[PDB]
């Protein structure tokens, strides 16, 4: 009985994970990353 709920919580977890990964990958594929090598003299 434990393997069903383990596989369910695991599948759910990795589903959240891949949805997040894909979403953020599209986000970085869109935003153009806002690249800034240096900011201040302290840097």
């Amino acid at each position: 009985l434990s393997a069903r709920i383990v596989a369910g919580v695991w599948w759910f977890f990795t589903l959240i994970i891949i949805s997040s990964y894909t979403a953020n990958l599209a986000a970085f594929l869109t935003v153009e990353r806002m690249v800034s090598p240096i900011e201040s003299a302290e840097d």
Partner: protein, 48 residues
């Protein structure tokens, strides 16, 4: 300084000399940054 005083020119040249010597920068930095709280100076990637 008072109009046409005898102190205008010397304090003027003084201000310039101090600014060039770095006294002004160090002093301002002293009362603004050196004495002051939360001095992280953009730490932990605050800009991004």
């Amino acid at each position: 300084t008072p109009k046409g005083s005898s102190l205008g020119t010397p304090v003027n040249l003084a201000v310039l000399k101090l600014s060039e010597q770095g006294v002004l920068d160090k002093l301002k930095n002293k009362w603004w940054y050196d004495k002051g709280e939360c001095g992280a100076k953009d730490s932990g990637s605050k800009e991004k």
